[PDB]
């Protein structure tokens, strides 16, 4: 129902090893559709999803111009932040930026995003009002004054409320057979004895899209959050995702445990038990 578009920029300095690398990737929901890498033999925006290929040469040339410009801009920004923090020219540092729009299940703009980080720490973020900034420290405050002076917020707001939503809806239509298709998880429970009086119940969810999913174990109807081992949702490599949740239970008490699965693709939440 709900959909989002997001661009992720990573700019990485590397003194003694050339100018900072700039990488940009674009996603609709959990589907990447473009990439750009300033380190590539011949740097250009490239397609990473079938439905984007139909876009014309104007589209690709415009994207590449933007990312090439960004490559240079982010190199200057890296120099700037090094200075803001009085850091050595010997160190490697990273600026990250993520921005994009969220749509509701009806297609309307839910909210916009634009956040930056430096060395993995929040640095500056456009507020939900799309009009004001939140700066993490006195360094980010300098960036803030700069951006206020250039009326950056006003331009992001125009983008996020306009072009971002328009293009997202276009992509959603062009890729509707996949982007607007929720694949439910294939689920089962496996049993792995660990000792004479304990065994592991592992609840599996496989082949689902999008990545958002809830896997929980209950014992006698009570959530076992603190005793459940929950691995991070991982990509299968075919656009689908995998996840499992495990609990160590007393042997013979297996039937007191139930696994519960919530996923957008499910006509109704699932309850599973180990089936000997």
């Amino acid at each position: 129902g709900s959909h989002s578009m997001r661009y992720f920029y990573t700019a990485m300095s590397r003194p003694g090893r050339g100018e900072p690398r700039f990488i940009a990737v674009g996603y609709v929901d959990d589907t990447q559709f473009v990439r750009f890498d300033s380190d590539a033999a011949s740097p250009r925006t490239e397609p990473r999803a079938p439905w984007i290929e139909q876009e014309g040469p104007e589209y690709w040339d415009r994207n590449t111009q933007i990312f090439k410009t960004n490559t240079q801009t982010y190199r200057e920004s890296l120099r700037n932040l090094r200075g803001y923090y009085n850091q050595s020219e010997a160190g490697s540092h990273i600026i990250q930026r993520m921005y994009g729009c969220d749509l509701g299940p009806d297609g309307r703009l839910l909210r916009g995003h634009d956040q930056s980080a430096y060395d993995g720490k929040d640095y500056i973020a456009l507020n939900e009002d799309l009009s004001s900034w939140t700066a993490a420290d006195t360094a980010a405050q300098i960036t803030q004054r700069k951006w206020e002076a250039a009326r950056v917020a006003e331009q992001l707001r125009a983008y996020l409320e306009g072009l971002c939503v328009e293009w997202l809806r276009r992509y959603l239509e062009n890729g509707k057979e996949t982007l607007q298709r929720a694949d439910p998880p294939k689920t089962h429970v496996t049993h792995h004895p660990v000792s004479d009086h304990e065994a592991t119940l592992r609840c599996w969810a496989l082949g689902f899209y999008p990545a958002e999913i809830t896997l929980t174990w209950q014992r006698d109807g009570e959530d076992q959050t603190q005793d459940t081992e929950l691995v991070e949702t991982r990509p299968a490599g075919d656009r689908t995702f995998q996840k499992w949740a495990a609990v160590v239970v007393p042997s013979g008490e297996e039937q007191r445990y139930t696994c519960h699965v919530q996923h957008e693709g499910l006509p109704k939440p699932l309850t599973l038990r180990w089936e000997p």
């Binding site: 990473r48 990273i94 691995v231 991070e232 991982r234 990509p235 299968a236 490599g237 995998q242």
Partner: protein, 99 residues
């Protein structure tokens, strides 16, 4: 300042000895982004391993998927060797088909 990579080694489809599949090593939650990842077959580095484009999660930590075609068997041992600035020495994670 820095975050060590989480590592998962697994297959794309359920593992059946003798059938072609894809071996995955998913590194995530790490920072900075520079990372060395190799897929091993019986201790030896596999050639022509591919990987996804660098991206990151809401907490700014990076993630990458490294993958290659492979055909599982009873004896053959597969693993993932990861090196990161946070690691004193490279970390080897063996593929467990139940994980």
């Amino acid at each position: 300042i820095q975050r060590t990579p989480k590592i998962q080694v697994y297959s794309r489809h359920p593992a059946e000895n003798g059938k072609s599949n894809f071996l995955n090593c998913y590194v995530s939650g790490f920072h900075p982004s520079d990372i060395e990842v190799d897929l091993l077959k019986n201790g030896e580095r596999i050639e022509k391993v591919e990987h996804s484009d660098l991206s990151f999660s809401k907490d700014w930590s990076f993630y990458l998927l490294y993958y290659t075609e492979f055909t599982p068997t009873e004896k053959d041992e597969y693993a993932c060797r990861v090196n990161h600035v946070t690691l004193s020495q490279p970390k080897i994670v063996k593929w467990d088909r139940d994980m």
